[PDB]
Amino acid sequence: FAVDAAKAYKDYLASGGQPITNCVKMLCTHTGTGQAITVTPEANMDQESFGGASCCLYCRCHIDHPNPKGFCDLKGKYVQIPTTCANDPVGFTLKNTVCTVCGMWKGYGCSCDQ
Protein backbone atom coordinates (compact mmCIF):
# COMPACT_ATOMS: atom_id res chain seq x y z
CA PHE A 1 0.00 0.00 0.00
CA ALA A 2 0.98 3.60 -0.77
CA VAL A 3 -1.14 6.72 -1.19
CA ASP A 4 -1.40 7.83 -4.84
CA ALA A 5 -1.61 11.58 -4.36
CA ALA A 6 -0.77 12.25 -8.02
CA LYS A 7 -3.75 10.17 -9.14
CA ALA A 8 -5.93 11.59 -6.35
CA TYR A 9 -5.22 15.16 -7.48
CA LYS A 10 -5.83 14.47 -11.18
CA ASP A 11 -9.07 12.71 -10.21
CA TYR A 12 -10.13 15.64 -8.02
CA LEU A 13 -9.54 18.10 -10.88
CA ALA A 14 -11.64 16.00 -13.28
CA SER A 15 -14.42 16.18 -10.66
CA GLY A 16 -14.39 19.98 -10.98
CA GLY A 17 -12.33 20.69 -7.87
CA GLN A 18 -10.58 24.03 -7.46
CA PRO A 19 -6.83 23.78 -8.23
CA ILE A 20 -4.30 24.26 -5.44
CA THR A 21 -3.85 28.00 -4.84
CA ASN A 22 -1.14 30.32 -3.51
CA CYS A 23 1.61 29.10 -5.79
CA VAL A 24 4.20 31.87 -5.55
CA LYS A 25 4.40 33.79 -8.84
CA MET A 26 7.56 35.86 -9.29
CA LEU A 27 8.22 39.20 -10.91
CA CYS A 28 10.57 38.78 -13.87
CA THR A 29 11.38 40.24 -17.29
CA HIS A 30 9.54 37.54 -19.29
CA THR A 31 12.52 37.54 -21.67
CA GLY A 32 14.08 34.33 -20.31
CA THR A 33 15.14 31.01 -21.88
CA GLY A 34 11.73 29.44 -21.35
CA GLN A 35 13.24 26.24 -19.93
CA ALA A 36 10.95 24.35 -17.58
CA ILE A 37 12.92 24.28 -14.28
CA THR A 38 15.74 26.73 -13.65
CA VAL A 39 17.91 28.17 -10.88
CA THR A 40 16.37 31.66 -11.45
CA PRO A 41 13.07 32.73 -13.08
CA GLU A 42 13.30 32.17 -16.82
CA ALA A 43 9.79 32.80 -18.14
CA ASN A 44 9.58 33.88 -21.76
CA MET A 45 6.78 36.08 -23.09
CA ASP A 46 4.42 33.09 -23.06
CA GLN A 47 5.12 31.98 -19.49
CA GLU A 48 4.92 32.80 -15.79
CA SER A 49 7.66 31.83 -13.32
CA PHE A 50 6.82 30.34 -9.92
CA GLY A 51 8.80 29.42 -6.83
CA GLY A 52 9.30 25.69 -7.23
CA ALA A 53 8.39 24.36 -3.78
CA SER A 54 5.02 26.10 -3.89
CA CYS A 55 4.05 24.21 -7.09
CA CYS A 56 5.13 20.74 -5.92
CA LEU A 57 2.17 18.53 -5.00
CA TYR A 58 4.26 16.59 -2.49
CA CYS A 59 5.76 19.65 -0.80
CA ARG A 60 2.35 21.33 -0.63
CA CYS A 61 0.48 18.27 0.69
CA HIS A 62 3.22 17.36 3.25
CA ILE A 63 3.73 13.85 1.84
CA ASP A 64 6.76 11.90 0.69
CA HIS A 65 8.12 12.52 -2.78
CA PRO A 66 7.75 9.34 -4.89
CA ASN A 67 11.34 8.26 -5.53
CA PRO A 68 13.45 6.09 -3.17
CA LYS A 69 15.66 9.07 -2.28
CA GLY A 70 12.76 11.44 -1.59
CA PHE A 71 14.51 14.24 -3.52
CA CYS A 72 12.45 17.15 -4.89
CA ASP A 73 13.30 18.49 -8.31
CA LEU A 74 11.23 21.69 -7.80
CA LYS A 75 12.14 22.94 -4.30
CA GLY A 76 14.72 25.74 -4.38
CA LYS A 77 14.24 26.20 -8.14
CA TYR A 78 11.81 28.16 -10.34
CA VAL A 79 9.27 26.52 -12.63
CA GLN A 80 8.03 28.16 -15.84
CA ILE A 81 4.34 27.58 -16.58
CA PRO A 82 2.57 28.52 -19.85
CA THR A 83 0.43 31.53 -19.04
CA THR A 84 -2.71 29.75 -20.26
CA CYS A 85 -2.07 27.01 -17.65
CA ALA A 86 -0.92 29.26 -14.79
CA ASN A 87 -4.20 28.88 -12.87
CA ASP A 88 -3.03 25.35 -11.87
CA PRO A 89 0.78 25.17 -11.65
CA VAL A 90 0.68 22.08 -9.41
CA GLY A 91 -1.45 20.15 -11.89
CA PHE A 92 0.68 21.31 -14.81
CA THR A 93 3.97 20.15 -13.30
CA LEU A 94 2.31 16.87 -12.26
CA LYS A 95 0.85 16.14 -15.71
CA ASN A 96 3.84 17.14 -17.86
CA THR A 97 7.43 16.12 -18.52
CA VAL A 98 10.66 18.02 -19.12
CA CYS A 99 12.76 17.12 -22.16
CA THR A 100 16.14 15.81 -21.03
CA VAL A 101 17.85 17.27 -24.13
CA CYS A 102 16.75 20.92 -24.35
CA GLY A 103 15.06 21.44 -20.97
CA MET A 104 11.71 22.66 -22.32
CA TRP A 105 8.37 21.15 -21.40
CA LYS A 106 7.36 18.38 -23.77
CA GLY A 107 4.51 19.83 -25.80
CA TYR A 108 5.16 23.38 -24.58
CA GLY A 109 8.48 24.50 -26.03
CA CYS A 110 10.44 21.34 -26.83
CA SER A 111 10.92 21.20 -30.61
CA CYS A 112 13.34 18.25 -30.61
CA ASP A 113 10.76 16.24 -32.61
CA GLN A 114 10.86 18.45 -35.73
Added chain:
Amino acid sequence: SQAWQPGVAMPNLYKMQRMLLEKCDLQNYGDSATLPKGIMMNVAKYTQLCQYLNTLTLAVPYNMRVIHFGAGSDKGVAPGTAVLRQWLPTGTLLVDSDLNDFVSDADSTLIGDCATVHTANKWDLIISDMYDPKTKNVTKENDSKEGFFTYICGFIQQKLALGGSVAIKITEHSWNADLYKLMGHFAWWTAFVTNVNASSSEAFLIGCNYLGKPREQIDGYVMHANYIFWRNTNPIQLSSYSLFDMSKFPLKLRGTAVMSLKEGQINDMILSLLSKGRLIIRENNRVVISSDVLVN
Protein backbone atom coordinates in the same frame (compact mmCIF):
# COMPACT_ATOMS: atom_id res chain seq x y z
CA SER B 1 8.77 62.21 -7.40
CA GLN B 2 9.37 59.00 -5.44
CA ALA B 3 6.73 56.93 -7.23
CA TRP B 4 9.27 55.34 -9.58
CA GLN B 5 11.61 54.30 -6.73
CA PRO B 6 11.12 50.94 -4.96
CA GLY B 7 10.25 52.88 -1.81
CA VAL B 8 11.27 55.79 0.40
CA ALA B 9 14.05 55.90 3.00
CA MET B 10 13.82 58.05 6.15
CA PRO B 11 15.53 61.39 5.30
CA ASN B 12 18.61 62.22 7.37
CA LEU B 13 17.10 65.37 8.88
CA TYR B 14 14.25 63.37 10.46
CA LYS B 15 16.83 61.07 12.09
CA MET B 16 18.35 64.11 13.84
CA GLN B 17 15.17 65.35 15.51
CA ARG B 18 14.14 64.75 19.09
CA MET B 19 10.42 64.08 18.77
CA LEU B 20 7.98 62.68 21.29
CA LEU B 21 6.06 59.57 20.32
CA GLU B 22 2.65 60.18 18.75
CA LYS B 23 -0.06 57.98 17.32
CA CYS B 24 0.65 57.11 13.69
CA ASP B 25 -2.12 58.60 11.51
CA LEU B 26 -1.36 57.92 7.84
CA GLN B 27 -3.13 60.09 5.26
CA ASN B 28 -3.10 57.28 2.66
CA TYR B 29 -4.32 54.74 5.30
CA GLY B 30 -7.04 53.35 3.04
CA ASP B 31 -5.19 53.30 -0.29
CA SER B 32 -3.83 50.10 -1.84
CA ALA B 33 -1.35 49.87 -4.66
CA THR B 34 -2.41 48.15 -7.87
CA LEU B 35 -0.36 44.98 -7.97
CA PRO B 36 0.52 43.31 -11.29
CA LYS B 37 -1.97 40.57 -12.13
CA GLY B 38 -1.62 37.56 -9.84
CA ILE B 39 1.33 38.96 -7.84
CA MET B 40 1.15 38.56 -4.04
CA MET B 41 1.63 41.58 -1.78
CA ASN B 42 4.58 39.91 -0.11
CA VAL B 43 6.31 39.07 -3.39
CA ALA B 44 5.95 42.76 -4.33
CA LYS B 45 7.11 43.96 -0.90
CA TYR B 46 10.26 41.81 -0.83
CA THR B 47 11.00 42.69 -4.45
CA GLN B 48 10.99 46.41 -3.59
CA LEU B 49 13.12 45.74 -0.48
CA CYS B 50 15.70 43.91 -2.59
CA GLN B 51 15.57 46.63 -5.25
CA TYR B 52 16.41 49.14 -2.51
CA LEU B 53 19.16 46.95 -1.04
CA ASN B 54 20.71 46.90 -4.54
CA THR B 55 21.49 50.62 -4.06
CA LEU B 56 23.54 50.12 -0.86
CA THR B 57 27.11 48.92 -0.27
CA LEU B 58 26.22 45.35 0.66
CA ALA B 59 29.12 42.93 1.04
CA VAL B 60 28.49 40.00 -1.33
CA PRO B 61 31.13 37.28 -0.81
CA TYR B 62 31.34 34.02 -2.65
CA ASN B 63 29.36 31.46 -0.66
CA MET B 64 27.21 34.19 0.87
CA ARG B 65 25.23 33.18 3.96
CA VAL B 66 21.74 34.63 4.45
CA ILE B 67 19.23 33.83 7.18
CA HIS B 68 15.55 34.81 6.90
CA PHE B 69 13.40 34.96 10.05
CA GLY B 70 9.62 35.12 9.93
CA ALA B 71 9.59 33.47 6.50
CA GLY B 72 6.31 31.57 6.83
CA SER B 73 2.85 32.80 5.95
CA ASP B 74 -0.76 31.93 6.62
CA LYS B 75 -0.71 30.45 3.10
CA GLY B 76 1.79 27.76 4.15
CA VAL B 77 4.38 28.97 1.61
CA ALA B 78 7.33 31.41 1.77
CA PRO B 79 6.92 34.18 -0.84
CA GLY B 80 9.68 36.36 0.60
CA THR B 81 12.12 33.44 0.64
CA ALA B 82 11.39 32.81 -3.06
CA VAL B 83 12.19 36.48 -3.80
CA LEU B 84 15.40 36.33 -1.75
CA ARG B 85 16.45 33.17 -3.58
CA GLN B 86 15.77 34.96 -6.87
CA TRP B 87 17.73 38.06 -5.82
CA LEU B 88 20.77 36.39 -4.23
CA PRO B 89 23.62 34.96 -6.37
CA THR B 90 23.25 31.34 -7.37
CA GLY B 91 24.90 29.16 -4.75
CA THR B 92 24.10 31.53 -1.87
CA LEU B 93 23.32 29.56 1.27
CA LEU B 94 19.83 30.59 2.44
CA VAL B 95 18.27 29.41 5.72
CA ASP B 96 14.78 30.43 6.75
CA SER B 97 12.64 30.03 9.83
CA ASP B 98 9.17 30.59 11.25
CA LEU B 99 7.09 29.76 14.30
CA ASN B 100 4.67 27.74 12.14
CA ASP B 101 5.23 25.05 9.52
CA PHE B 102 5.54 26.15 5.88
CA VAL B 103 6.96 25.00 2.54
CA SER B 104 10.18 26.72 1.49
CA ASP B 105 12.70 27.14 -1.34
CA ALA B 106 15.47 27.74 1.24
CA ASP B 107 18.43 25.37 1.51
CA SER B 108 17.28 24.59 5.05
CA THR B 109 14.24 25.55 7.15
CA LEU B 110 13.84 25.57 10.94
CA ILE B 111 10.36 25.55 12.49
CA GLY B 112 9.86 26.92 16.00
CA ASP B 113 10.11 30.08 18.05
CA CYS B 114 13.15 32.03 16.86
CA ALA B 115 14.57 31.86 20.39
CA THR B 116 15.09 28.11 19.81
CA VAL B 117 17.34 28.70 16.75
CA HIS B 118 21.12 28.36 17.14
CA THR B 119 23.82 28.57 14.49
CA ALA B 120 27.48 27.70 14.78
CA ASN B 121 28.46 30.13 12.02
CA LYS B 122 28.12 33.86 11.41
CA TRP B 123 25.93 35.34 8.65
CA ASP B 124 26.44 37.97 5.95
CA LEU B 125 22.83 39.16 5.77
CA ILE B 126 19.93 38.82 8.22
CA ILE B 127 16.33 39.45 7.07
CA SER B 128 13.46 39.42 9.55
CA ASP B 129 9.77 39.79 8.75
CA MET B 130 8.67 38.52 12.17
CA TYR B 131 5.51 40.21 13.36
CA ASP B 132 2.80 39.47 15.93
CA PRO B 133 -0.53 41.19 15.10
CA LYS B 134 -1.33 41.21 18.82
CA THR B 135 1.12 44.12 19.31
CA LYS B 136 -1.29 46.52 17.58
CA ASN B 137 -3.08 47.68 20.77
CA VAL B 138 -4.27 51.27 20.34
CA THR B 139 -5.79 51.30 23.85
CA LYS B 140 -2.49 50.98 25.77
CA GLU B 141 0.80 52.85 25.71
CA ASN B 142 3.02 52.04 22.73
CA ASP B 143 6.11 50.83 24.59
CA SER B 144 9.28 49.15 23.28
CA LYS B 145 8.54 45.45 22.63
CA GLU B 146 10.63 42.46 23.63
CA GLY B 147 9.78 38.93 22.48
CA PHE B 148 11.53 38.12 19.22
CA PHE B 149 13.17 41.58 19.18
CA THR B 150 15.30 40.54 22.15
CA TYR B 151 16.42 37.47 20.20
CA ILE B 152 17.21 39.51 17.06
CA CYS B 153 19.38 41.99 18.99
CA GLY B 154 21.45 39.19 20.50
CA PHE B 155 21.62 37.33 17.20
CA ILE B 156 23.00 40.40 15.44
CA GLN B 157 25.63 41.02 18.09
CA GLN B 158 26.74 37.36 18.26
CA LYS B 159 26.16 35.94 14.76
CA LEU B 160 26.40 38.78 12.21
CA ALA B 161 29.75 39.00 10.42
CA LEU B 162 31.51 42.33 10.54
CA GLY B 163 30.67 44.00 7.26
CA GLY B 164 27.30 42.21 7.15
CA SER B 165 23.90 43.89 6.91
CA VAL B 166 20.37 43.48 8.26
CA ALA B 167 16.80 44.35 7.30
CA ILE B 168 14.35 43.98 10.22
CA LYS B 169 10.63 44.66 9.79
CA ILE B 170 9.04 47.09 12.28
CA THR B 171 5.68 48.88 12.52
CA GLU B 172 4.17 51.64 14.64
CA HIS B 173 3.59 49.15 17.48
CA SER B 174 6.08 46.37 16.58
CA TRP B 175 9.45 47.92 17.44
CA ASN B 176 12.26 47.78 19.98
CA ALA B 177 14.46 50.53 21.42
CA ASP B 178 17.63 48.43 21.53
CA LEU B 179 17.27 47.50 17.86
CA TYR B 180 17.37 51.20 16.93
CA LYS B 181 20.39 51.64 19.22
CA LEU B 182 22.08 48.74 17.45
CA MET B 183 21.65 50.55 14.16
CA GLY B 184 24.35 52.91 15.39
CA HIS B 185 26.77 49.93 15.23
CA PHE B 186 26.58 49.90 11.42
CA ALA B 187 28.39 52.18 8.99
CA TRP B 188 24.97 53.45 7.83
CA TRP B 189 21.31 52.83 8.63
CA THR B 190 17.81 53.81 7.59
CA ALA B 191 14.14 52.96 7.90
CA PHE B 192 12.80 52.00 4.47
CA VAL B 193 9.13 52.00 3.45
CA THR B 194 8.20 50.00 0.36
CA ASN B 195 6.09 51.92 -2.15
CA VAL B 196 3.60 49.05 -2.49
CA ASN B 197 2.87 49.09 1.26
CA ALA B 198 3.19 52.83 1.96
CA SER B 199 -0.31 52.95 3.48
CA SER B 200 1.06 50.93 6.42
CA SER B 201 3.29 52.07 9.30
CA GLU B 202 5.54 49.11 8.41
CA ALA B 203 9.19 49.84 7.59
CA PHE B 204 12.37 47.82 7.30
CA LEU B 205 15.10 48.96 9.68
CA ILE B 206 18.22 48.51 7.56
CA GLY B 207 21.71 48.36 9.00
CA CYS B 208 24.44 48.53 6.34
CA ASN B 209 27.93 47.12 7.07
CA TYR B 210 28.20 45.96 10.67
CA LEU B 211 31.14 47.40 12.61
CA GLY B 212 30.67 45.54 15.92
CA LYS B 213 30.89 48.71 18.02
CA PRO B 214 28.88 51.94 18.28
CA ARG B 215 29.94 54.51 15.75
CA GLU B 216 27.09 56.74 16.94
CA GLN B 217 24.90 56.70 20.03
CA ILE B 218 21.20 56.35 19.21
CA ASP B 219 18.38 56.63 21.73
CA GLY B 220 15.85 54.10 20.46
CA TYR B 221 12.77 55.62 22.07
CA VAL B 222 13.55 58.97 20.45
CA MET B 223 14.38 57.46 17.08
CA HIS B 224 11.11 55.52 16.87
CA ALA B 225 9.28 58.75 17.65
CA ASN B 226 11.29 60.42 14.88
CA TYR B 227 10.29 57.62 12.50
CA ILE B 228 6.59 58.05 13.35
CA PHE B 229 6.88 61.83 12.97
CA TRP B 230 8.37 61.35 9.49
CA ARG B 231 5.56 58.97 8.51
CA ASN B 232 2.90 61.29 9.98
CA THR B 233 4.07 64.33 8.01
CA ASN B 234 5.22 62.73 4.73
CA PRO B 235 2.46 60.84 2.89
CA ILE B 236 4.01 58.35 0.48
CA GLN B 237 2.07 57.74 -2.71
CA LEU B 238 1.26 54.04 -3.17
CA SER B 239 3.13 52.71 -6.18
CA SER B 240 4.01 49.44 -7.90
CA TYR B 241 5.93 51.12 -10.76
CA SER B 242 9.31 49.63 -9.88
CA LEU B 243 7.92 46.07 -10.07
CA PHE B 244 7.63 46.30 -13.87
CA ASP B 245 11.38 46.69 -14.59
CA MET B 246 13.18 43.63 -13.37
CA SER B 247 16.17 43.81 -15.71
CA LYS B 248 18.68 44.92 -13.05
CA PHE B 249 17.17 42.98 -10.13
CA PRO B 250 19.83 40.31 -9.32
CA LEU B 251 22.27 41.23 -6.56
CA LYS B 252 25.68 41.82 -8.14
CA LEU B 253 28.18 39.15 -7.13
CA ARG B 254 31.04 41.34 -5.88
CA GLY B 255 33.27 38.50 -4.60
CA THR B 256 33.85 40.43 -1.38
CA ALA B 257 36.89 39.29 0.57
CA VAL B 258 36.25 37.15 3.66
CA MET B 259 38.93 37.15 6.35
CA SER B 260 39.14 35.86 9.89
CA LEU B 261 40.55 38.40 12.33
CA LYS B 262 40.88 38.65 16.09
CA GLU B 263 39.33 41.71 17.72
CA GLY B 264 42.82 43.11 18.29
CA GLN B 265 43.43 43.45 14.54
CA ILE B 266 40.32 45.51 13.69
CA ASN B 267 42.27 48.71 13.03
CA ASP B 268 41.01 51.91 11.39
CA MET B 269 41.97 50.69 7.93
CA ILE B 270 39.96 47.49 8.45
CA LEU B 271 37.03 49.59 9.72
CA SER B 272 37.26 51.65 6.52
CA LEU B 273 37.02 48.57 4.31
CA LEU B 274 34.08 47.22 6.32
CA SER B 275 32.31 50.58 5.97
CA LYS B 276 32.60 50.44 2.16
CA GLY B 277 31.15 46.96 1.68
CA ARG B 278 34.61 45.69 0.75
CA LEU B 279 35.26 43.20 3.57
CA ILE B 280 33.48 40.49 5.57
CA ILE B 281 35.07 39.23 8.80
CA ARG B 282 34.07 35.72 9.89
CA GLU B 283 35.21 32.12 9.66
CA ASN B 284 34.53 30.05 6.55
CA ASN B 285 33.84 26.67 8.15
CA ARG B 286 30.74 24.53 7.62
CA VAL B 287 27.29 26.05 8.20
CA VAL B 288 25.53 24.17 11.00
CA ILE B 289 22.15 25.17 12.46
CA SER B 290 19.74 23.67 14.97
CA SER B 291 16.42 24.22 16.71
CA ASP B 292 16.05 23.40 20.42
CA VAL B 293 13.19 21.00 21.15
CA LEU B 294 11.48 21.08 24.55
CA VAL B 295 10.52 17.55 25.62
CA ASN B 296 7.19 17.51 27.53
